[PDB]
Symmetry: D2
Subunit: 452 residues, 4 copies
């Protein structure tokens, strides 16, 4: 298998897209920018319904970290199918869900007392985090960051602050969430270069919470939790300054506020550590995970300080939580990560840094590149001084990559995320970066952007 694309979308792709439009609700599907219609998958490749072969830099939005069709994950699933699929994890007991909980407790950041609540998705895991924090602190308010993405349920829609269309006609959602600027080193209300001056940007974000919220309208004692992504995902693959979470933890600790680390996108080895928060040297009170945990099967986990546990039975539960097929898949995922995929993300890191810095030097349309491990963000701007979003052009780069056999996803208003499966070879990575560079070059030439 190698990238090989003729007509896309082909006739079979166009037929499915038409049928999708007829029977399915309008969500985030784009017939003009995302015309990929997947039929099957092999190693790091998609094969679409017309036989087109595409190199995967999407991981299906950071879910297929261990590969598009991991054989070790599939064996575990088939083995679990011969035993039981659903055991009603929350009314009856089963050993598969308990074996996963024991492993998640062990691999949790830091070395503190942990328990786990299992669910079916990232948004469920964040909803469970909200409930654990409310119950354990008896506090009802939360702080979240502008640009955040935590899910689309009534609780998590209040935490999410990515695109206003996410909230259109939804008000009122869960009350009690206040938002403050993320320490985005490329775009922040202070105009601070947070790469050159990380401490200045850290102090402005901390000062905003302390002076602007705590000293005026948000009683610090009534805040249950601060929710954060350790790198903002949907918001643009935004990597905050290295010392930010240490300063955030000093502020939270002074007021008895929990730190809630959303690893739904950046966890499960994506940054060359089991958790992205590991690069920032703090131990969050709650960690939420989903997506890559189940290696393609729906699963969520909320890993929390043990003493936060619900005092009584029946405060939270679900039907599908502790799903044995999901539990089997996740145990197989974690062993793959620990046996070389995390190390492979650390090894590939400098290839991604070097090539993307080379692309920033050469192509003016690139405002910023940023990343850790195999989580990389490239933001496109009309002008490096105004930083006006190159949204049209970003979309065209994705489309040109597809035509050349590379599957990419946009993030934020004008960025692209590069998130290839952690099984990707050096040679597969170089090929995808070369195709990515060609798509930028094409759209740069087509719009007259400087090429140095």
């Amino acid at each position: 298998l190698k990238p090989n694309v003729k007509e896309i979308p082909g006739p079979k792709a166009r037929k499915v897209i038409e049928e999708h439009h007829k029977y399915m609700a309008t969500t985030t599907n784009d017939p003009n920018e995302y015309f990929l219609v997947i039929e099957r998958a092999e190693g790091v490749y998609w094969i679409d319904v017309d036989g087109n072969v595409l190199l995967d830099f999407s991981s299906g939005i950071g879910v297929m970290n261990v590969g598009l069709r991991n054989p070790k994950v599939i064996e575990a699933i088939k083995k679990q199918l011969d035993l039981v699929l659903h055991a009603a994890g929350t009314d009856y007991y089963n050993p598969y869900q308990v074996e996963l909980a024991k492993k998640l407790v062990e691999i949790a950041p830091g070395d503190i007392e942990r328990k786990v609540f299992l669910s079916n998705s990232g948004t469920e895991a964040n909803e469970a985090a909200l409930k654990i924090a409310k119950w354990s602190t008896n506090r009802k308010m939360f702080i979240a960051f502008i640009g955040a993405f935590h899910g689309r349920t009534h609780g998590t829609m209040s935490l999410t602050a990515s695109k206003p269309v996410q909230r259109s006609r939804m008000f009122p959602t869960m009350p009690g969430v206040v938002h403050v600027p993320y320490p985005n080193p490329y775009r922040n209300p202070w105009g601070i270069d947070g790469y050159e001056n990380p401490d200045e940007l850290i102090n402005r974000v901390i000062d905003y919470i302390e002076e602007y919220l705590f000293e005026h309208y948000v009683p610090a004692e009534e805040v249950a939790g601060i929710f954060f992504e350790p790198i903002q995902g949907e918001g643009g693959y935004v990597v905050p300054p290295k010392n930010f979470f240490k300063e955030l933890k000093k502020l939270a600790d002074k007021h008895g506020i929990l730190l809630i680390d959303d690893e739904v996108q950046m966890g499960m080895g994506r940054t060359g550590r089991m958790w992205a928060i590991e690069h920032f040297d703090i131990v969050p009170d709650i960690v939420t995970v989903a997506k890559a945990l189940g290696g393609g099967i729906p699963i969520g986990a909320t890993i929390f300080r043990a003493d936060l546990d619900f005092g009584v039975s029946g405060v939270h539960s679900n039907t599908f939580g502790g799903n044995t097929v999901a539990a089997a898949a996740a145990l197989a995922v974690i062993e793959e990560l620990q046996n070389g995929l995390i190390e492979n993300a650390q090894k590939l890191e400098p290839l991604f840094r070097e090539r993307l810095e080379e692309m920033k030097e050469k192509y003016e349309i690139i405002g910023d590149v940023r990343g850790l491990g195999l989580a990389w963000g490239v933001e496109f701007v009309k002008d490096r001084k105004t930083k006006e979003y190159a949204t049209k052009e970003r979309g065209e780069i994705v489309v040109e990559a597809l035509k050349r056999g590379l599957a990419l996803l946009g993030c934020g208003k004008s960025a692209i995320r590069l998130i290839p499966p952690l099984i990707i070879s050096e040679e597969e990575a170089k090929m995808g970066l070369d195709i990515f560079e060609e798509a930028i070059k094409v759209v740069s030439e087509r719009h007259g952007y400087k090429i140095h």
Copy 2:
């Protein structure tokens, strides 16, 4: 296989239960009333980790309708694992999710045009219903019924009114939900026998909404939706009067209010129709399903009138939605249902009605039996006049059934649900009802309840 129980919980079960309490959050597991630790399943039987063999009358809380471990569903999953697992159904397209959406549209109640939003759970399917209703109507309030269960997320916790511990320290959840009494023919605020006088009970509930809410504090024009279970599940397997939903729909239509039918527990053939609402001759605007749809793989679906679609992209989305493995499972489930399992529910309905009415005649501790298809509730009371809940006795009956190789679940404060897989034979069903009756006899004799 036959019901065969020695010590339960056995030594391997006790080890799992202790590990569960150590590593996992406190939810709805009960070491005292539900000490069932499942290792595998075969036909209508659980095999626990100590080799005990139990006849299943739980169906994993109404999820395993097509049997504890269906070969057609397993075959379809294995076939799907060969092609792909996750294709990012909400960014990219794939034919598998579209095939399921088309089928759900076709089997939806009534003959109006529909679309589908796919999710991972019942609570997600109901959160999507909230969002669809708010967007499409531009109204923000909802009516739900006392005793309802719709899920534990911030939006669905406001809809749910089953047990107050479900809300403990969670206020505020999503504002805007008002609750009114369910037309429960055994227990209602008016003292009405809703079996003997159904129209009187219907009329009291309808008049409570019109006279008490609409004419006093709830502007009818601001209500987006009325959420209902067609039989309350977690609330006690409560079957409302046959004409109630017709009268509810007249009131809703008068005010432009949507009807949202929660079929998460009563759907997928349980009541001897594909949808439980089909017994009540209305066409709801929105139908939610989960649990049984995936035959053991987590899935949810929100089926709605096509003109309620989100008019713009990015209002609602999910990661795992349109999961290809769940979709393959769901199409298999629907084929099995349409090709014989629903007919089986229809055939065994009279055996349950006959056996449960005989038990009610013989055992004074039984206050009420009610049901449709293979959905049966039996409610235990201390005295048939007071209808004082026999909560302790109900728990003792579940334990005595389990010791004798029958897995039952409680529902409401003093009821038991009988929900065996729809593949159950007449002989297997008779074996179950016999054990259930032996358990009732034992607990009656212990406490001095009359046996006629």
Copy 3:
């Protein structure tokens, strides 16, 4: 002065009404049902701008208890205008507000220690009660009754459940209020005659709270307070059964819930006790008063158990609170009340009961008469069996009374309130009841209602 009416509304009245509609917001003024344009007042009489003279049975919606224009109250105001008007009672101190606070503490129901928060209105007094209850209990939910009126501010609009137009497009107001049926002995969801069977109605309301709210969706421990009117005013002058509040207090005490008695309309001597709750033999935790307290100057007061005080400065405050002119007026009002006006209410109670029961015997259009002291409600119905509201007829009776020189107000959907100033003579009262009866006779004859 005697009732004397020629044209109403006369030419000067019509000019004022037209100017009102041009310059002022649309509220609860009614050019068709309430065309009374007041120029001055003398004793128990309004003199309108065209010189019409009307006997007042309105008391300015229960504000002018001490008479339409009391000389002792006017003397005290004039004396206070000589010294000071506003002294900023919440930053600086003054002896006038303190003298009133001391008096209110002394005349509060029961013999427990109290403190007082002074405000400008009934809605302010009730918003202060919400804040006192939330702070002192650290709980956030409230129970209120269907038919209640507590004010139109964002906190009190959630408590109020009188007419849905009061809430139109205002959602969301303050979250956390659940409503249950009032023990209205004439109209209730159970169809109970609460006059003949008061304990049955009490028991249904108490059981609705315990069984339907506490045992299903409202955690009793999270309820800060139960708000009630001791007689519902705007809801129809509805007198609940004499033992209801005693049973309500048992339920509240069991759960640590405060009792908040809204006396804004029924206090200051109206019912022939200083507080209407004194008829029902309980000591509420919080009492709110306004309207009549100031004898025509805006004032409100929130009287509470001293141990509910805000433990810290700056939680609640106001500008005009402890206004010295209002305080001087209020002390005068309380002296007049204690020195004869409350005795007058006691003396005239039997004349109202006798005359209104005679009217109920004679006029079939009257469904119900109810009252205490000088607080009387008469409810008009199309048919004594259906109790269909005679809303049009009720409005016609108010208009026919006005044409004959009696000012009445509607209450609820088809009732009239009789609330004459407490200085009214037996002769003046008889003149009023005679005009009221003539108005009922006229509207009965017009529509063919039986006259026995």
Copy 4:
């Protein structure tokens, strides 16, 4: 009368303070910083209960703009007392309330169609503004400014963002308010000197609303209104840049958002214009007023664009609104303002600017002085570089002014407001500024602050 103070608090003052503490709720009274106990008032002087005479620079928190005891206001009141006090302004009509509404429509900023809703206080007037805006736009969200003060009711507590103690245990209040930094030229999150660079600070506040809120989590189309004070009062007498409201109006107009101008403290001539918004050259959609409007009698008004009017009767109302004593007082207040008090505020302005700039040059403890007309703020800091709040010292300056016969109020964390009645003479103003300078000098010497 001249400032003459011996012992303060004297024995009679100490007795009232003790009694206040016994019978009245803990609010914003300070026995240690505000020991003034007012007995009567004359011209611009308080006389306390021990015969101490103090020059008034407080106006009783901006209420006594026309004087402590205006004779023209008192005559109007006594004249209205001979006619009627309360006419039930919202059920019946009266010419006094209509004459006030007609005058408020006329004096409203700009020349656009207006109507008026009358209430009893600033917080009621702001609550009415929230309801008018919600009803007229059918939008439920609001933007308010950090540092804002709009009242302590459930609606206005959401708008208020001055001290977190104002909200202690009150959550949840009315949902839907988002807060952004005020353009405070002395203290803002960008560290911008807004005196030297007003356009830079304006653009940062506008950009924060547009880029940070509108482009991320606050759909601009769902915002009913932006609430602002034209000078922040309780927050510190903060005067925004001259062009700020023109830029705010361009932003609001682009999205159909209302501008709601809170003049409860800065209106009724205080800044040498009838309204403070007049200095900023925009025409707000809604204007709220109270305090000084009633010249010492409780009153509120909400003046709004006529087409916003409530479409139906019964959405908003009150009992005491249109109170004829209040209406008479307010008509007399407005005539005093228009006949020379507003002009007197313009005349005294440069005396206040010159003396306070002289004090800033001389006393290092002064960080900032700012003001318009007779509204002036002096902010005290420990260090002019850190701007650390000199809260202890601010309180001591107030106390030393009192001992020397000047009544001052603190504002914000370390400011003092100078708000003398608009009837103050040049000679009275110089005397109060000389006493104010002596109090600063004393506390400067006492703490070692530089005196240049």
